[PDB]
Design an enzyme around this catalytic site. Sequence first.
Site, PDB file in Angstrom:
ATOM      1  N   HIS B  11      51.155 107.884 -64.031  1.00 25.71           N
ATOM      2  CA  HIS B  11      52.420 108.192 -64.694  1.00 25.71           C
ATOM      3  C   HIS B  11      53.009 106.900 -65.242  1.00 25.71           C
ATOM      4  O   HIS B  11      52.647 105.797 -64.813  1.00 25.71           O
ATOM      5  CB  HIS B  11      53.413 108.889 -63.754  1.00 25.71           C
ATOM      6  CG  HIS B  11      53.913 108.029 -62.633  1.00 25.71           C
ATOM      7  ND1 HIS B  11      54.735 106.939 -62.833  1.00 25.71           N
ATOM      8  CD2 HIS B  11      53.723 108.114 -61.294  1.00 25.71           C
ATOM      9  CE1 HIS B  11      55.013 106.379 -61.669  1.00 25.71           C
ATOM     10  NE2 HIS B  11      54.413 107.073 -60.718  1.00 25.71           N
ATOM     11  N   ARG B  62      58.511 112.168 -61.731  1.00 22.71           N
ATOM     12  CA  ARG B  62      57.881 111.289 -62.709  1.00 22.71           C
ATOM     13  C   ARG B  62      56.430 111.684 -62.942  1.00 22.71           C
ATOM     14  O   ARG B  62      55.899 111.495 -64.046  1.00 22.71           O
ATOM     15  CB  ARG B  62      57.993 109.834 -62.265  1.00 22.71           C
ATOM     16  CG  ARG B  62      57.346 109.489 -60.922  1.00 22.71           C
ATOM     17  CD  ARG B  62      57.865 108.123 -60.471  1.00 22.71           C
ATOM     18  NE  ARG B  62      57.246 107.607 -59.254  1.00 22.71           N
ATOM     19  CZ  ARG B  62      57.754 107.728 -58.034  1.00 22.71           C
ATOM     20  NH1 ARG B  62      58.826 108.466 -57.798  1.00 22.71           N
ATOM     21  NH2 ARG B  62      57.176 107.083 -57.023  1.00 22.71           N
ATOM     22  N   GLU B  89      53.340 109.418 -53.843  1.00 19.50           N
ATOM     23  CA  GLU B  89      53.329 107.995 -53.522  1.00 19.50           C
ATOM     24  C   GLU B  89      53.659 107.801 -52.042  1.00 19.50           C
ATOM     25  O   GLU B  89      54.162 108.729 -51.404  1.00 19.50           O
ATOM     26  CB  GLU B  89      54.343 107.277 -54.421  1.00 19.50           C
ATOM     27  CG  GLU B  89      54.525 105.787 -54.163  1.00 19.50           C
ATOM     28  CD  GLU B  89      53.274 104.983 -54.450  1.00 19.50           C
ATOM     29  OE1 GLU B  89      52.348 105.005 -53.613  1.00 19.50           O
ATOM     30  OE2 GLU B  89      53.215 104.335 -55.518  1.00 19.50           O
ATOM     31  N   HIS B 183      50.062 108.630 -58.896  1.00 20.20           N
ATOM     32  CA  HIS B 183      50.700 107.345 -58.675  1.00 20.20           C
ATOM     33  C   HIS B 183      49.637 106.274 -58.478  1.00 20.20           C
ATOM     34  O   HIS B 183      48.515 106.560 -58.053  1.00 20.20           O
ATOM     35  CB  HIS B 183      51.618 107.441 -57.461  1.00 20.20           C
ATOM     36  CG  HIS B 183      52.541 108.615 -57.523  1.00 20.20           C
ATOM     37  ND1 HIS B 183      53.763 108.565 -58.155  1.00 20.20           N
ATOM     38  CD2 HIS B 183      52.398 109.887 -57.079  1.00 20.20           C
ATOM     39  CE1 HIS B 183      54.346 109.747 -58.076  1.00 20.20           C
ATOM     40  NE2 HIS B 183      53.538 110.568 -57.429  1.00 20.20           N
TER      41      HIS B 183
END
Lengths: 228, 222, 230, 224
Positions: B11, B62, B89, B183
């Site tokens: 991302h 995100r 994450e 991530h």
Amino acid sequence: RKKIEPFSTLVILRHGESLSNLNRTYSGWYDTDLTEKGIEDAYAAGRLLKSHGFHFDVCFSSYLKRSIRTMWIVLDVLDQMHIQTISNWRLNECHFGLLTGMNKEQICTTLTEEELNIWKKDTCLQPPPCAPGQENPSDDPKYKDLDPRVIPNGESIDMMWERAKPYFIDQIVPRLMEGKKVLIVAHGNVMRAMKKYLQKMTSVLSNGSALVFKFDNKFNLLETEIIS
Amino acid sequence: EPFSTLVILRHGESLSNLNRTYSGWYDTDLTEKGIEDAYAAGRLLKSHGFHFDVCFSSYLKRSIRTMWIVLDVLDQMHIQTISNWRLNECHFGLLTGMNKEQICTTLTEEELNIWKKDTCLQPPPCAPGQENPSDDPKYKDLDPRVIPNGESIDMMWERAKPYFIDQIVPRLMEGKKVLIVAHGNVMRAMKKYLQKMLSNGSALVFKFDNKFNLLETEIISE
Amino acid sequence: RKKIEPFSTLVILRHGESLSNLNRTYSGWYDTDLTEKGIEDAYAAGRLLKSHGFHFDVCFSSYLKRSIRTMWIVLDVLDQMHIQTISNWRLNECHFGLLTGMNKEQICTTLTEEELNIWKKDTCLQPPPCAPGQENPSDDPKYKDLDPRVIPNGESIDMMWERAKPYFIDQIVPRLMEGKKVLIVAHGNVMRAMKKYLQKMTSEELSNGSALVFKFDNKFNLLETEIISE
Amino acid sequence: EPFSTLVILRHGESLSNLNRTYSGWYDTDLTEKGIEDAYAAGRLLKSHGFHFDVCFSSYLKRSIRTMWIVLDVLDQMHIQTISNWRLNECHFGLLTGMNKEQICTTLTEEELNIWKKDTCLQPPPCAPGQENPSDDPKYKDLDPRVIPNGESIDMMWERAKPYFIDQIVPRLMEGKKVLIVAHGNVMRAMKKYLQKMTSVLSNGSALVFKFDNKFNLLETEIIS
Ligand SMILES: [Cl-]
């Protein structure tokens, strides 16, 4: 005389006598089937659950035939042969590696005295892997699609629970959060690990008994009931 | 062409990244540049002709928004998407929301060095009175016991790995093309796992045969 | 030696003798179970598929016991008891309504001579619903979660297929388009309707224990229909 | 509160709607106003406190994009979403891409009146050389036999009804809150089905159906 129901219910049932159990050899992933007595064990378990009025939304089993066959017999008795059933390797018994197929005498020869005591009382002792030339149950075609890196070869009970736990959390818990009644037909070591996990215990049940876990809508454990 | 294909894509810029604070599970959204990063990522995959059967994201915005933008560019807004917390994450616990100076004040010289160079340092949990991102209602149905509070990279991978093995590998064994919008730490852990062991805007392309042997890892970029 | 394999394969089996079949009464949704001979029919069907080397990715049945039990036995013979199984009411036999439980004599009494001929030769004749006081198989608890408006009460074969067809298109075809091998343990009328749909036969145009094998390419073109038997 | 809840929302302005042409399966996208319609709809659902377990849409971009925008406003971008062709608008066949004047030329006086007043007129199939929206690669995995080419509203509901019964009703029976971002004709057919009407809402309203545990419709509320 009626009792207030829980938001969700998990019933765990142990499979009955397998041929390896009757012959007193360790099986693990060895795909031993029910004996005639083990089939009758499954019918008795089905009648136990029926007498308590259980109607399940889904039933889980391991990939081992003794668990699958017990599930089918139990659902037959409950008149619930139509419900969703799910089988997965992560509910399998420990893979015993080298110890697969051994009897009591071979175990005592392979393990030291100290190792045998740890093997009986604790959950941390890992067996070695299958030897060259030893038939390994995981070479079975039913496992052909699994990530080869993940397939165990000699598992302690702790290692078994480390790969069963994600399945319990990702498949069983979400269904309990939906308010469903879930049945699991399980191996003894897996059943005891789940019981320890749910009750938050730290580190022996009559044959034919079942565990009933009752939860509220926030997944608080309200009660653990043993039925027999 | 290979039997199956896995593309992993990172991302783009988040607001926390732009302000140079650590987010972890803090649910920071894309900046204007992060949105343009997603469009550029989409055009990179479109120029290489990718048509995916499924796309995965984390439970973090995100990651989800980037997936939606990429699929829009690919004209694949209709394909199945799956989001799951196990691709999140690391949960940074106490370090959540801190900037670089605060990380040094909180961590000793040895702790900061292992945190930077290694994967094994576990930050402490959120302090009392600290807003914990896992209290978000989107996590309300998870088993309360499994929610992390302070994770090393090693711990993050130990809870992401079962998801990769149970949801990603079976689809690749079926011959599918799978996209993951991930991530950075999760992408590096998956790469390290698959290879039995990157410039901004790059993507990883893993090609497999029908026995799940890794034939090739290709890095594509603009 | 070896033959080039199709992209996807669909095998359809019929279940074996039920108690209603042995007693010569129409069952429909009546949840009659296999006889001892029906159990042996299922073992033999399993051996048939085993001798042809089939390995299925998924198996489908109706919600009717005689179909489910046949599926379980066949998978036991195939050593595929672990594979995914899916059961759904849309693969059920016709709901025979008033005709449920009737024998030959009662059918001939109930229908005119014209109606009976259309009943045997066509697929468009609809039975009346269950009478007051007649036990209706759809009141079974296994159907408690269905939309009450969708539950049939007296179906022609055409009506049965109109509610089975969306299930075939939405659940079986997508798996065939994934390249999977699919087993369906079905009722005779459902198997015949599926065969007619796939082959694009007209309304104008298998021995007991035979199976149908449909082979497809990756655009779902029917490449071959093979009938297999012992 | 009710046992289960269904909310149905219609997508906002598409480019074809702005140009006053009939799209059907033609995959026209939202306009800038249409995107603002989706944000407004999301704020409407947020002000009533809706938290959904799942959202459904058609395979058409104007429905999917509206779903994404609404879920963004609701802070529910993480929830499960399901898109399926069976919730698509009617496939208009030959009439695809035509405006009001052209439909007069194509249809007789009676046919046009049946087209406007009733739900039973089936348009003819796409003409030779006419780009058919079903030739889109997004439909490449469907049974080719099932793909429509000229659908009356009645035919549209005959292929949408099984999807409603097999996917939406079981979730309402589980006690879930379900959102559907739909086309007007599909929304009206579901409303008629649920209320048992026999064979007129502002562009930005939403329907709310409340059910008990036996799937009895307790109430239908219109919010705007
Ligand atoms: Cl047809």
